[model samples]
Target: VRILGYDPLASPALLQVQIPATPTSLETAKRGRREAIDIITGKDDRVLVIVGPCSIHDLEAAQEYALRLKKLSDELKGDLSIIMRAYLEKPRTTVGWKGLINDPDVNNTFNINKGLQSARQLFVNLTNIGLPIGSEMLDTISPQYLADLVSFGAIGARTTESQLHRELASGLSFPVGFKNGTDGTLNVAVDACQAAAHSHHFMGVTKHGVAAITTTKGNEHCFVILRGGKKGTNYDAKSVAEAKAQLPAGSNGLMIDYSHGNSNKDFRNQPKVNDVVCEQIANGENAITGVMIESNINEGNQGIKYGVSITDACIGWETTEDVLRKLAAAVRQRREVNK
Candidate 1:
């Protein structure tokens, strides 16, 4: 095999120096981490709703979405802990458009350094909107550059069972969600939670971009996410019950997804999943700690329209708002029953 030429990039430390987090954004991230832990630990009665574009491709469109989201987030503050899904990395089963930080050009240029710069800028801007950001920790090295701004992290289904991924989760500073395997087995994610709760020393890069040995004290804020499997969606009450029972005591709470397997990989079926979850929560199902949604400014994909997802199809703003309102009401109903 022929070797490809290497392109140098800025160190994580240098990138932070250039595009740094402000005090306001720092506070937003701090508050988000705390509130997420509260929701996971049951100290917070409100549900967590992680919603946004499946991937970040356009800056202007994301800004437009963020502007509208902060208003709704402020309004729903009493009932839900909201975090914007500002995912920059996309994991593929085979190969396709990587994401904003891998092939920002969408032309296969693979100018990763440029992608990193653009991603950092967008993350800082979103953080300033007083929104807690959640991203998939796909690239182990990429986290060093954006980790400070990310309040929540997700290990995708494909990587949930990887020891490297679990070790990475163990070191993350914020709450981590380990998704079940693609086949939809809860054991992998359960095993992940247990593994990530222990300290580990691993090979990684430093702020200066130099390879080094990194050690972590272990992250206690770890949980499982059921995104459905080849069998079918698991957002229903019975599946949720099994997941709750399977998880170890004192572990993080469960979260279900409306997209992917739950939607049968179809964009139109997400709401049905939402309705089922809301129905359960409305009737006092406390097993679910949160939910994930693939949404954008306008529903569906293509154009690569502004605020439209180019990867997975997503529900538009109108539909997204409707879901959130319904969820907020569902939480309130559950509270009444429990009281």
Candidate 2:
């Protein structure tokens, strides 16, 4: 075989032992998942808000962000189901730092063992603070080690059309959101949702790190996320309605990504985009069920500078808190009007 020598890696089961979730953290994760599912399924009237750093590179910054978000989540629990974005992987257009998991050393030295250990420990830490964690599932194998700790998962735009990701979503325990294609094709995301709603058998790894054929009973808790496309943004009312029309009957409403193409890749515009979404909710447009924002302790992004984003830029912590509060207020108005 013309390949680099393979190194021994720890099994998912072993990693779980080294960084185990306490019973309380497990229960907290379960409760958060249930609440998020309720909101997505329309059984709960609150808006689901998943907000945090674009990618986690600093453990202390992540914990600090989680603590603040947890307090806000509690305050807005009546109007919003908040989940922290604990993204550990970054899908590059060409080549860059993959994420915290692919390269723990910001210097490009791929130390996956340390990455896995750190990522799992962070998940446990955030959950212990009574915060539900959400992540973008990029690498299929990595999920075996960390999925149990995540309350929500997302298949990014780049992979929405990949049959592999669609199949993977079918087996995930929590709700999964499939982002539209990078070119902004809603039909592709719609198709992915439909595909994930049916049973499928595929090859995957077991918790023991052994290759296995995984069979999934299909996950009904799937929805589309409009992250805009090559043409332009799609979080507008017409775009959202068009996407919803493509979904199966009784499926939850759409999720809008305030970053990415929606904000024209400018982190400063995320707040404006989110405000528009909040207005839609307040105006009785209940079909918009959730919003995703890229936020960090500091505004903007840095390049492996430590304690800041190394990938996509993000709105700062103060802006994040402000937008979330506004969203919750809008949801409250929505409830009053509906009542």
Candidate 3:
């Protein structure tokens, strides 16, 4: 008798009916990512800014933000390579609101299938409009579902030491940024970079959703993100210089995040952090490369009741644009100064 149990061999044709074919390919989507990184690292005369909401809950808001950012990218295309932070899965300190994709329902209903489809659709729409995407590689399963559309990837502070993440980064086709640990240690990021730069064999799911042992040739585009930790802020010039010195010669450059511990967990202090970074750039600091901003269409953050944000607040859209404009202007001015 056929038991009414889980059917592991369910026909993929049936699954395809619910999950439409993604219109973009990984190879083509991340085509400009390397060049973008080259610019951000100062090998080219351009700046890179990865900007977007801290966590995307409202799809409409994300699309609106993308439209505005697309216009800004064009306006500043001469000096900046802009990437939208289309983050899907978030890693929390304790068990709480994971992200929109993990808990799409404000209530307890986890419609992850729907969330995945929604996220993939958003990526397609954004890239179709000529804007590349950036995402944090937190959940190992997430990359299997959405990594194809991303141009840049990040390994957060909480997971920088995970060998699984390092292996995952090795197989990723796009550039990856590994952030320092929450305790303000730069060695974790350096270790992560070294680990990601070598070939590895690990167990992972294939594109066809099959579990198998995967071998990778490692990723060449790897860098560090200074987000600060227990030791206080790392956006200062001394920290930048030290972080740069820690990396091997001819390594990919560093990206500074103006949020989290770097801002003392205060959203309003984001501008001050940017000012410091801009000052460093103006002073001919070649080690500092890109910047990541966690701004939404709305300013500040709301507490997560059921499945929303329950952590630090964020600065609103107007403030976000203002900060970005200032940074872009700084890049323009710094370009002149360097000349």
Candidate 4:
């Protein structure tokens, strides 16, 4: 029996050749990154809302969600800037469906080449539709394949401690968020941001898939994302204050997630968390500059419905819209007080 097999997949250059990014798509990506940068730094008062299904298993469903989000984004333009979570990789504790890039068929059979192309194509289309896309940068190697098309990115809780991930974030072209530890700690994420803000070198491959040492200048755009861990939810005001205090005295920022550990892993609880955050914003909480919510059209898990998530259960579109409205109101309220 073979311990391992080496089957080369298409390099990024070749893959981009097949699914080239249009000028409009590239502009969307750049604009998304720029806006996210300003929001994360608190230079822009608008709240950054990262919303989409937990993981995308169907292209049609994802595109539909993007279209809906675009409309809602337009509705709430002045207060909340929206970014669709184009998450392709889901970090697993043990083992399961890695992501769209690891298992495109959802059949447990690995078809990485197909997954890569499908993922890039989806990103291109979403951006072309004028929607900014966000995703987790789990596999360092894969980012080279799709990073150009992504605007906002995250280093999941599990990998935040990995020096490899920190180094990767430093070299990335877009802004990155380091999510808090899974066990509910915040300092690790703060540390990760600091780490990413420094230059480092790591073994990586070029766009041509050649093995090479990659050195990157420190990324000042790195920020923290507080996703409650085993300890409990960190979406409370104190947690936000604690996280904010850890950052460089007067600058940089952090985001609060309404799912995963924050929601106690239950979809129903996400809205309550959402309300809590919105209230914080309305009360003029400056530490919180960004928020992430999990949403799908039908909102059930395991794929019983057409637009529902096959992975983490998400809030229904009905709820998603209302949540955005309330969040917008909160931002407006905060503006009233801050003025």
Lowest lDDT 10-residue stretch of candidate 4: 244-253
RMSD of each: 1.1, 1.1, 3.8, 1.3
Give the poorly placed runs of model 4, Cα more than 4 Å off: none
Shift in Å, residue 313, candidate 1: 0.4
Tens digits of per-residue lDDT for model 4, 182-286: 889988888888899899988899999999988899899888888998888999988887776677763477789999899987999988998899899899887
Q: Check candidate 3 and list the clashing pairs.
A: 299-316, 304-309
Better of 1 and 3 by lDDT: 1
Q: Model 2: per-residue lDDT, tens digit, 77-179? A: 9998999999999998898899888898878889999999999999999998889999999998999998888899999999999999999999999999999
**Runs off by more than 4 Å, candidate 2:** none
- Per-prediction TM-score, please? 0.98, 0.98, 0.90, 0.97
For candidate 1, write residues 25-144 as lDDT tens digits.
Answer: 898999899999999888987998899998889888898898899999999999999999998999887888989999989998998888999999998899898888999999999999
Cα TM-score of candidate 2: 0.98
Per-candidate Cα lDDT values, in order, are 0.91, 0.89, 0.78, 0.89
Tens digit of per-residue lDDT, candidate 3, span 122-213: 77777766778888999776677666578899999999999999999999988899999999979999999899989999888776767799
- Superposition TM-score, candidate 4 onto the true structure: 0.97
Clashes of 1: 0
Candidate achieving the largest lDDT:
1
Q: What's the best-to-worst order under lDDT?
A: 1, 4, 2, 3
